Design a protein around this ligand. Structure first.
Ligand code: ZN
Lengths: 128, 216, 81, 181
RNA sequence: GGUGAAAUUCUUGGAUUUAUUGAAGACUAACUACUGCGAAAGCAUUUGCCAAGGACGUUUUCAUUAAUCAAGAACGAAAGUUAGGGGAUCGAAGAUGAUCAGAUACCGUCGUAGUCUUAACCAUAAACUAUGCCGACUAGGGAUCGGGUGGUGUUUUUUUAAUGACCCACUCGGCACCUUACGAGAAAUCAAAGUCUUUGGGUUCUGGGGGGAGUAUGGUCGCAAGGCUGAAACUUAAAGGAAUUG
């Protein structure tokens, strides 16, 4: 019953996938790993594979420090941007839940505006 | 090269006595060396925990409480109430097409010089025999409902300090009071107070905090 | 339909139509003889009244104006004449 | 050590849910072996795991993703394909994500993504081995990471106003360069 | 960070990230609909003040005071001009980068005016329903918004009277929707684009094959950008629209 709880931010952007594990108070972080720290290719930084590797590494580190259960708070880049988590976020979440940590109270904390300022692209959209 | 997590020590954070389970978790902090104590680096942290982990039941699964850390002694850091919010998923599920959203807020003060901003929410409904598909409401109805909700919220806040307000907000008796008052104007399903937050604080007054704590 | 008598319409179909769009237009209002309980005076009020009419005897109220017919006050006698 | 996931269901998807209910929970309790319940009063689906079951928290994650994918409007067999294979993911974005269309322009962009009788949509359905779902204004793509990236680029080019002929040609080119490896 | 891939950029004075607090300007998501309002352009957080409007109801009052309208006048999206303010985001100009067969992926970062506001200008938009305004008649149906009428109809008073919400029927005025052809049309399609070779209810504006050409010139408005009015010489046998078939 005396299992120490932390919280894990999962930042799922279209270029990187941040996995951050902190204690209950948002300060005093424990372990932060990005997608680029596990892959050296300059093209697989946003891939689900890099997110999975980062989640495994941060799971090993958080098991080492002492904590054994984390509440997951996942978010996209948000704002005027896409505001919906991408496949790197689900990959990191599945790899975190796979490695034996107790997972409870999964909640999306993406920043959603009350119809805020303009976005880049200028009337013809981001040409993609 | 230094392994900073070895010099750190863990402290035990415990909720105020108003909730059922008054032991909420653990936190870690650096060792109290010279010219930077471990006390003053801890006296302002705000945690956010779900209400169910405070109350056990699953009927309070959507709410969550922000608790500010106020005092510390002997690994025990003592907290107070700072705010309440719904989770985002419940807020997204409540908003539905073909019905009217109603929001209201007031800023008020308690018996002591706390300052609160409180946000209440409501939606319309159909009373089980309505063939009409939407059941919107006219603007005079929404204005009357905002006035009634604002007056109830103000009356139920200034009549007590923060302790009885939390003790009245945990079993959500204000929602049933609003449902009683506005049922003669329009149906109004799904009435909640979606958010409360502190704005300004008076002097610390450790006696009141230690009176709220100090049991068990 | 298309074989009928527009000169002598049936009373139900004649009363279902608009006041203006009747074969001969005429009012749908009436005058109420009102006896309030505070006295024995009789007041002839309009059914579609627009003012808070009040009789001179004991001078309290007879009716309240409304967007359609005037809503009466508490229980008073009224005859449709 | 019981672990639970409690996820809500929108109303317009709940009446097909029970309509397919007998096809959903048996594999989840036979092939994957959890506790699955439908709490109608809170409008939610509850999944609980216990150490009596199989040693697989990833099974619980897969079941949660299964229910969450089906409740967005996806088909049942495609959700089963999500449940068995472990490579498929979901991407979701709005039309206003790409270009702030309004009024009839958003309606015509939706009609451009779909096409007559879904035919245009069926094209991106075929040449990318994905699963496209058009909501009121947001769109979801299901499949592998490269496949959903291809479908995202195709449908973004559809939103911005490119005619269906160019995306047909680009789609056959990408399908030819895709199936050759 | 960034793209298909790079490079510029920031960073062991700690960048990106997480937590607490403050400041600034802009905008009002989800609710949001074949729903509402306004002469149109256009209009979405709460509350207060000010005047204004339509529809309904009326056994009120005036009694033809009315419809359309060269002259003349008010308003008129965005961009733009002139002085003051404010400047968060985005961003014409400009600055720099890699410019790798192809960018199917002609892009990246910073950023001026501008976007916001006050006081004056300008008067144009695919300013579109591509359908002038007023009036009359002609067809079925289901919805929905505002008012009104009838119901020993349903529900909440804390004892079941009132009001509110709903249901059923009728009516007036709306925004619209599905089918049809007694009719119309080149056709797509239209309850008007009908009541038209069986041609006439009232009244404004406009067009007369295409280029030259919204051009020259004159006049006039505007500080300017430009706006309004606006030809001919010459030249040509086409130009155009609606459906079917590949
Ligand atoms: Zn009286």
């Amino acid at each position: 019953n005396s299992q120490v709880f932390g919280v894990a931010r999962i930042y799922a952007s279209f270029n990187d996938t941040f996995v951050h594990v902190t204690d209950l108070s948002g300060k005093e972080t424990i372990a932060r790993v990005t997608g680029g720290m596990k892959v050296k290719a300059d093209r697989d930084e946003s891939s689900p594979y890099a997110a999975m590797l980062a989640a495994q590494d941060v799971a090993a580190k958080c098991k080492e420090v002492g904590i054994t259960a984390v509440h997951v708070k996942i978010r996209a880049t948000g704002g005027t941007r896409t505001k919906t988590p991408g496949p790197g976020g689900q990959a990191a979440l599945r790899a975190l839940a796979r490695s034996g940590l107790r997972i409870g109270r999964i909640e999306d904390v993406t920043p959603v505006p009350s119809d805020s300022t303009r976005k880049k692209g200028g009337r013809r959209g981001r040409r993609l | 090269v230094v392994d900073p997590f070895t010099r750190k020590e863990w402290f035990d954070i415990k909720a105020p006595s108003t909730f059922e389970n008054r032991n909420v978790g653990k936190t870690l902090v650096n060792k109290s060396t010279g010219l930077k104590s471990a006390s003053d680096a801890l006296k302002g942290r705000v945690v956010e925990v779900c209400l169910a982990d405070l109350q056990g039941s699953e009927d309070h699964s959507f709410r969550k409480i922000k608790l500010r850390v106020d005092e510390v002694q002997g690994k025990n850091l003592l907290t107070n109430f700072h705010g309440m919010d719904f989770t985002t998923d419940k807020l997204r599920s409540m908003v539905r097409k073909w019905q009217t959203l109603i929001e209201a807020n007031v800023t008020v003060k308690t018996s002591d010089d706390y300052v609160l901003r409180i946000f209440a929410i409501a939606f319309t409904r159909k009373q089980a025999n309505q063939v009409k598909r939407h059941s919107y409401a006219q603007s005079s109805h929404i204005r009357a409902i905002r006035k009634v909700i604002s007056e109830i919220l103000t009356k139920e806040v200034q009549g007590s300090t923060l302790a009885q307000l939390t003790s009245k907000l945990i079993p959500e008796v204000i929602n049933k009071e609003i449902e009683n008052a506005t049922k003669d104007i329009f149906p109004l399903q799904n009435i909640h107070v979606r958010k409360v937050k502190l704005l300004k604080q008076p002097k610390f007054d450790v006696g009141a905090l230690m009176a709220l704590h100090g049991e068990g | 339909v298309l074989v009928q008598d527009l000169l002598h319409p049936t009373a139900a179909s004649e009363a279902r139509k608009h006041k203006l769009k009747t074969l001969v237009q005429g009012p749908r209002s009436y005058f109420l003889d009102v006896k309030c309980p505070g006295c024995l005076n009789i007041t002839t009020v309009f059914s579609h009244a627009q003012t808070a009419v009040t009789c001179e005897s004991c001078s309290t109220i007879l009716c309240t104006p409304t967007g359609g017919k005037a809503k009466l006050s508490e229980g008073t006698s009224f005859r449709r004449k | 050590k019981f672990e639970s996931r409690k996820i809500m269901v929108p109303p317009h998807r709940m009446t097909p849910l029970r309509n397919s209910w007998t096809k959903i929970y048996p594999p989840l309790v036979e092939h994957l072996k959890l506790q699955v319940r439908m709490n109608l009063k809170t409008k939610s689906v509850e999944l609980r795991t216990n150490p009596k079951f199989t040693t697989d928290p990833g099974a619980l994650q897969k079941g949660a993703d299964f229910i969450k994918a089906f409740t967005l409007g996806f088909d049942l067999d495609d959700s089963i394909a999500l449940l068995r294979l472990d490579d498929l993911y979901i991407e979701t974005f709005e039309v206003k994500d790409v270009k702030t269309l309004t009024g009839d322009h958003l309606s015509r962009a939706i009609g451009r993504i779909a096409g007559k009788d879904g035919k245009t949509k069926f094209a991106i359905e075929n040449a990318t081995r994905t699963r496209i779902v058009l909501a009121d204004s947001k769109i979801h793509i299901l499949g592998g990471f490269t496949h959903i990236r291809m479908a995202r680029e195709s449908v973004v080019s559809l939103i911005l106003g490119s005619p269906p002929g160019k995306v047909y040609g680009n789609l056959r080119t990408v399908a030819s360069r895709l199936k050759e490896r």
